[PDB]
């Protein structure tokens, strides 16, 4: 499951830390940024403890300095079964939902209910089905010889089981699972009989299994609101869910928690590029962070002393000071030559690219000259240029050809400022003619 080709943060499998929350120099695909990784590990221990709620953490720094990488590492080290809602800042300006309603849905998607239940199933291999039918179809009789690798039995079947076996046609040689209470019969496949293919089950026929369900609060909010069904969880037209059913869900969840029938898991809400939110969003967040059913909100931004959207003044990080009072700030730093070389080596091993040493030094030099992402993007173009001339190892001139073909930001600005008469300026004046 979970198909994926290659991502920009696909080499990161978690925060590289020891048992004392100390960062290794290189572990789980993350190098450098020791203090930020330690602080994110402390935040991970906050999430794993779960005894506190509504704490806001801001990750701020220069662009292309391990912010989204840190968020991806926290999400990978959280594991499965714990909600993680990663949204962008421009995703809440909707046309059918208000900004506060979309923010409320994104807040309530990150708190889960854990419910354990038990059900009994008959998973077996069908030896023989015998069906006795009448002329008019009044009374049906049925014998079912079914087995595992451990037992063997014969069952008399009633009329509704005859109807449920005729529908979704079960033949001899099949492996099926039957639910007695609901009457759901699933064909797992065919057994190992050459005369798809699965293994015949072992042990008892009538098994009792415990399944664990994690249901978000937003799902129960959609279900309890009678105006729309559960298909609004998939189609997306929930449409301004009222606060009365939210109050009923908030009371019933605590009622289940006191009786021990369910458990509370908190999650992480990540807001990438938080500076694009409006002032009314920040004013809503300032009061939504103080609820008992509030997750931990991590926000990432790279702006420095910019204009707050919806106002006319300037604020640090694009955020007003009342929101910044309610947050603790993790600050990232720029990378050195050695860490850039290590990151580029990790990305070379990730994309199955074989690199010479001098090509790696050239990539590190042009990475500390221009950008990390530019050298991270040249490394796969140079492999195709290498494969055009039929050799596996990327050499120095293979990097030089890709450097010549594909430009960066500074060279493009230089060439545009040199030949600005051929481009459209702000005033809309261009020159298309060559002569005169």
């Amino acid at each position: 499951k979970s198909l994926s080709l290659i991502a920009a943060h696909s080499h990161i499998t978690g925060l590289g830390l020891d048992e004392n929350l100390q960062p290794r120099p290189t572990s789980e695909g993350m190098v450098g940024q020791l203090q930020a990784r330690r602080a994110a590990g402390v935040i991970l221990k906050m999430v794993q403890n779960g005894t506190i709620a509504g704490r806001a953490v801001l990750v701020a720094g220069p662009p292309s300095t391990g912010k989204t990488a840190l968020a991806m590492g926290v999400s990978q080290s959280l594991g499965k079964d714990v909600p993680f809602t990663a949204i962008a800042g421009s995703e809440i300006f909707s046309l059918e939902l208000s900004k506060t309603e979309a923010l409320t849905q994104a807040f309530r998607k990150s708190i889960g209910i854990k419910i354990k239940e038990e059900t009994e199933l008959i998973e077996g291999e069908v030896v023989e089905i015998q069906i006795d039918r009448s002329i008019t179809g009044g009374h049906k009789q049925g014998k079912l010889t079914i087995k595992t690798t451990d037992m063997e039995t014969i069952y008399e079947l009633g009329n509704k089981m005859i109807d449920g076996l005729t529908k979704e046609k079960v033949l001899a040689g099949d492996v099926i699972s039957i639910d007695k209470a609901s009457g759901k019969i699933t064909k797992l496949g065919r057994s190992f009989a050459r005369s798809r293919f699965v293994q015949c089950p072992e042990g008892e026929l009538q098994k009792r299994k415990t399944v664990v369900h994690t249901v978000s609060l937003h799902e129960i909010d959609v279900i309890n609101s009678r105006t729309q069904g559960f298909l609004a969880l998939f189609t997306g037209d929930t449409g301004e869910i009222r606060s009365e059913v939210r109050d009923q869900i908030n009371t019933k969840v605590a009622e289940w928690k006191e009786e021990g029938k369910a458990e509370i898991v908190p999650g992480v809400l990540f807001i990438d590029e938080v500076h694009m939110l409006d002032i009314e969003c920040f004013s809503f967040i300032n009061r939504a962070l103080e609820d008992e059913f509030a997750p931990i909100v991590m926000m990432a931004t790279n702006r420095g002393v910019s204009k707050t959207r919806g106002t006319n003044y300037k604020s640090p990080h694009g955020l007003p000071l009342d929101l910044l009072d309610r947050s603790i700030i993790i600050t990232t730093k720029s990378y050195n030559e050695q860490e850039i070389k290590t990151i580029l080596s990790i990305r070379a091993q990730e994309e199955e690219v074989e690199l010479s040493s001098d090509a790696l030094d050239l990539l590190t030099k042009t990475g500390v000259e221009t950008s990390l992402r530019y050298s991270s993007n040249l490394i796969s173009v140079a492999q195709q240029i290498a494969m055009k001339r039929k050799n596996n190892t990327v050499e120095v001139e293979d990097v030089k050809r890709a450097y010549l073909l594909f430009l960066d930001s500074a060279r493009s600005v230089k060439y545009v400022q040199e030949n600005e008469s051929q481009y459209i300026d702000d005033q809309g004046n261009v020159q298309i003619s060559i002569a005169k």
Binding site: E117, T119, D179, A181, S182, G183, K184, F230, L231
Partner: protein, 135 residues
Amino acid sequence: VIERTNGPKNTDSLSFKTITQELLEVTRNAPSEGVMASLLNVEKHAYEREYLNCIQRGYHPNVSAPPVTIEVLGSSHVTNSINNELFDPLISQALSDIPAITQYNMHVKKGIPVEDFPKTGLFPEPLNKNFSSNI
């Protein structure tokens, strides 16, 4: 919508006949070459002039899927309610028709009157015979 009946209303009331409802009513059973019917039959004239009942179909959907199945393990009430909602007999009878020999068995052989039948045949007609299916 389904069991809407055209019951009579008394004259001493404030809801009267708006003019466009009167124009809709005078052309309910009016034949051809009448002036009000011909002024009210633009769309069928455009249908019969443009030869639209012999046209082909140029578009088919790529994927056709049933609605998402909701399952609750260990309860028959949810299965019964889901099967009632998916296959509501009143709506499913409204979107189809009774066979003619079955109707003859209800009315003559069983004594059931015509007005006691469930309402049938509310499905809208397709444009062509070619437009009635995705195959």
